[PDB]
Amino acid sequence: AHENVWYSHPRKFGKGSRQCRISGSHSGLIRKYGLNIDRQSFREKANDIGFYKYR
Amino acid sequence: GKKRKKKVYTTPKKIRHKHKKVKLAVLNYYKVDDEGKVAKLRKECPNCGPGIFLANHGDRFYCGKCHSTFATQK
């Protein structure tokens, strides 16, 4: 694990550049308004976030 | 939903590069002048500072405190 070879590849961008911040998942991520959280984690925490079903 | 085959290897072996347990490298490093002055052997490191002995390979004396800094011909 060379210090310049281990984890060498850049991650400035792309799918893996960002994490769920709740589960660390890559798939099903939401980036709108900087949520940076996935589909379903949003699905339940949104009520505490301030979101509510209206229409 | 899958059963995995055994990882058969067409590779003989790669073992940990064991460090060599050197027995009293300091006698190799120093040389006593009959209960008095003592000399050092084969160089001293100018890039690292006094007391750090250097490496003998060939046509170049080598560092290893700050390893990449000093490997010069002499």
Binding site: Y7, Q19, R21, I22, G24 | -
Partner: protein, 96 residues
């Protein structure tokens, strides 16, 4: 891990001074925040402390919140050989 001892003792000292630490999950990153060490062996040192029972870890949203126990304070003081009277700033009761 194989911590250069100075790094370990400065980690422990910072832990004592603050009384607690977070050390965000992100692995493989060079520089841990506000301590000038690598997050990796910070995390591993705190794991070693918890396996000793000196530290209680609450893990929420990938952050590893750490808390010191009194016996952890005692052992840390012994390791950092400070006078027995000193306390982490957490023990300095902030009364508002």
């Amino acid at each position: 891990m194989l911590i250069p001892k100075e790094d370990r003792k400065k980690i422990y000292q910072h832990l004592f001074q603050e009384g607690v630490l977070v050390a965000k999950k992100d692995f493989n990153q060079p520089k841990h925040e506000e301590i000038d060490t690598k997050n990796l062996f910070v995390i591993k040192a705190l794991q070693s402390l918890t396996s000793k029972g000196f530290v209680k870890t609450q893990f929420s949203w990938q952050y590893y919140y750490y808390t010191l126990t009194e016996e952890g304070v005692v052992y840390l003081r012994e390791y950092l050989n400070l006078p027995e009277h000193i306390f982490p700033a957490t023990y300095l009761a902030g009364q508002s």
